[PDB]
Every structure is written in structure tokens, then in C-alpha cells.
């Protein structure tokens, strides 16, 4: 399925759309392409559009970063074991917000550290206001490994490898989770990509490789 989606993405990058934006009528719950995609929530990604998926073809799982965390695994388990998908595509992307902050800064700002509160405003260009209380949850914001770059910075080699390392960790999480079959007759297959938000083109991430 997926090389065909990469060709749809080549068209998309070149200025030709493939997704049909109208309502498809009544459909069954099982994704017809037997695919699940995990992508960032970033507004610049329309996952169906950039892959040329049609409505009804794939599960679309999206969170901050497109990270493979506990919820992503919950989703993938349901997708495969209950709803019959057997392929997974990861779509991280360039200029991702998860490159631009650290867990501890945001935590401290929310808790009420005045320095962290000020620093987050400086990093974001908005008037961040502390909650002034601590929380146990969420336990982790899952910012990408590495020191932060400016928010929405243009691409670079260094940031591409930081994004790619996060993709590789997600591939390893899926390929070693006890409740996802990625070998034998019920197996799932998985590939990971980085979407360039400015060009519209996907590039594939190597696996195995370094993971953060």
C-alpha cells in the first residue's frame, strides 16, 4: 500500500492533490487499506492529504510529535487486534514543536517557577501564564532528545537526525512491545518517515539506527 502512498505524496509535494474531501457515504469500521498512521498533531499536516489516503482507508492516530507512547500503543493494539490493520506508518515532520522545548522547563513553568514562566514566553513569543500548581499527569511531555532549537526553525542536518532518532525509537517500541505481533502469522509491518512541511515531501528513516 505504502509505496503507492509515497507516489501520492510525490504528487502532493509537486502541487497535485489526491485525497477526495467529500463525505464517502456509509462505510465499515475496518480500515480498508489495513493501515494505521501515527503522525504529529501539527496543523500543517493533513495526513490523508499528504499520503493520498481516501476517507475510510486508514486509522489516523495523532499526538504532539507523533510519538510512540502508551496511548499510541493502546491505539495500535486496538487497530490491529480488533480492527484488522497490519501495517503501520510513522509520519514525524520538520519544524516540529517537540524540537523546541524541554519537559522540565514546561513543568516548572506550569508549577509556577517565575523564571521558567518568563523563559517559556521568550521561547514561544506568547504570554505564557503559569498554572501555579503541580500535577502528576502528564508524566512526560516527550520533547525530542537533544537541546532545544528555536520554535519553528527551518530544517537542518542536526534537527533532521534528532527527528529521525525519535522515529527510530518509535519503530523499536512497536517492534518490541509484548502486545504487538510484528513477526509470525498475525504480524504487523512498520516504516517511518519525516514529512517536510515546506516542500510537502516525505523522506524515509533508516532502521535499525540510533534512537536519541
Binding-site residues from annotation for Zn(2+): 40, 93, 96
Told to check if 183 binds its own copies by CB under 8 A, we report no
Position among 37, 67, 96, 120 found at the interface with Zn ion (CB under 5 A): 96
Which positions make up the binding site?
40, 93, 96
Work out whether the CA dihedral 98, 102, 104, 106 comes out positive or negative: negative
Question: Which one of its own copies, Na ion, Zn ion, none is in contact with 24 (Cβ closer than 5 to 8 A by kind)?
Answer: its own copies
Q: Which stretch binds Zn ion (CB under 5 A): 19-27, 36-44, 51-59, 155-163?
A: 36-44
What are all long-range contacts of 122-125, with beta carbons under 8 Å and residues at least 24 apart? Answer: 123/148, 123/150, 123/151, 124/151, 125/151
| Binding of residue 165 to Zn ion (CB under 5 A) | no
Under rule CB under 5 A, residue 36 binds Zn ion = no
The single residue listed with the C-alpha cell 517500541 is 173
Is residue 48 within the footprint of Na ion (CB under 5 A)? Answer: yes
Q: Does 42 bind Na ion (CB under 5 A)?
A: no
Q: Cis link prior to 138 (omega < 30° from 0)?
A: yes
SS3 46: coil
CA distance 174 to 69: 10
Question: Interface with Zn ion by CB under 5 A: which residues?
Answer: 40, 42, 96
* Interface contacts to Na ion, rule CB under 5 A: 46, 48
Amino acid at each position: 500500500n505504502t509505496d503507492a502512498l509515497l507516489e501520492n505524496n510525490r504528487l502532493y509535494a509537486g502541487g497535485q492533490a489526491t485525497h477526495r474531501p467529500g463525505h464517502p457515504g456509509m462505510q465499515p469500521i475496518q480500515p480498508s487499506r489495513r493501515v494505521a498512521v501515527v503522525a504529529c498533531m501539527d496543523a500543517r499536516l493533513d495526513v490523508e492529504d499528504l499520503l493520498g489516503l481516501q476517507t475510510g482507508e486508514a486509522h489516523i492516530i495523532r499526538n504532539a510529535g507523533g510519538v510512540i507512547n502508551e496511548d499510541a500503543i493502546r491505539c495500535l493494539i486496538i487497530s490491529h487486534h480488533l480492527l484488522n490493520t497490519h501495517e503501520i506508518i510513522l509520519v514525524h515532520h520538520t519544524r516540529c514543536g517537540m524540537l523546541a522545548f524541554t519537559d522540565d522547563l514546561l513543568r516548572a513553568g506550569l508549577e509556577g517557577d517565575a523564571a521558567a514562566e518568563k523563559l517559556i514566553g521568550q521561547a514561544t513569543g506568547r504570554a505564557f501564564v503559569s498554572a501555579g500548581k503541580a500535577s502528576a499527569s502528564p508524566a512526560a511531555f516527550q520533547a525530542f532528545r537533544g537541546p532545544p532549537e528555536p520554535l519553528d526553525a527551518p530544517r537542518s542536518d542536526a534537527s533532521t537526525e534528532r527527528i529521525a532518532a525519535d522515529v527510530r525509537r518509535g519503530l523499536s517500541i512497536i517492534l518490541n512491545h509484548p502486545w504487538l505481533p510484528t513477526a509470525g502469522p498475525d504480524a504487523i509491518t512498520v516504516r517511518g518517515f519525516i514529512y517536510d512541511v515546506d516542500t510537502g515531501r516525505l523522506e524515509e528513516v533508516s532502521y535499525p539506527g540510533p534512537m536519541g
